[PDB]
């Protein structure tokens, strides 16, 4: 069963966008976790595979994603990554649990249509 890039990338930006489009949520998920920028020198001790926003963009851009279900996790992992790392007081926290519900609704009717 073959997808081809430019295929996968019309059907699931748009859900990305979604994402982008999500404010104030979507800040902290924007560029690739820096620990000693951001203050937590711990980060990757705990997530081992990191994820974000931008990250997912040039896979999507660059052919990276073989089938959807590939970008759906990738999603997951960046939304798993949050909840794992920061306590359920965090903006971070909270925020992810707001665009997961972001998400769930976008990406619903295009995994069907797939
Ligand atoms: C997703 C990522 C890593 C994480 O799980 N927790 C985290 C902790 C502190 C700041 C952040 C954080 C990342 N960007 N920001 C900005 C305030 C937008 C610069 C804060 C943060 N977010």
Same mark, same amino acid.
């Given at each position: 069963?073959?997808?081809? @890039?430019? /295929?996968? &990338?019309?059907?699931?930006?748009?859900?990305? =966008?979604? $994402?982008? !489009?999500?404010?104030? =949520?979507? $800040?902290?998920? &924007? +560029?690739? #976790?820096?620990? +000693?920028?951001?203050?937590? @020198?711990?980060?990757?001790?705990? *997530?081992?595979? @990191?994820?974000?926003?931008?990250?997912?963009? &040039?896979?999507?851009?660059?052919?990276?994603?073989? /089938?959807?279900?590939?970008? *759906?996790?990738?999603?997951?992992?960046?939304?798993?990554?949050?909840?794992?790392?920061? &306590?359920?007081?965090? !903006? #971070?926290?909270?925020?992810?649990?707001?665009?997961? =519900? *972001?998400? /769930?609704? =976008?990406?619903? @009717? *295009?995994?069907?249509?797939?």
């Amino acid at each position: 069963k073959i997808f081809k @890039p430019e /295929e996968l &990338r019309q059907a699931l930006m748009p859900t990305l =966008e979604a $994402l982008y !489009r999500q404010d104030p =949520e979507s $800040l902290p998920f &924007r +560029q690739p #976790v820096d620990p +000693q920028l951001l203050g937590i @020198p711990d980060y990757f001790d705990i *997530v081992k595979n @990191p994820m974000d926003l931008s990250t997912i963009k &040039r896979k999507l851009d660059t052919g990276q994603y073989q /089938e959807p279900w590939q970008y *759906v996790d990738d999603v997951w992992l960046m939304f798993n990554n949050a909840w794992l790392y920061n &306590r359920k007081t965090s !903006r #971070v926290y909270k925020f992810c649990s707001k665009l997961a =519900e *972001v998400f /769930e609704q =976008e990406i619903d @009717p *295009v995994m069907q249509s797939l």
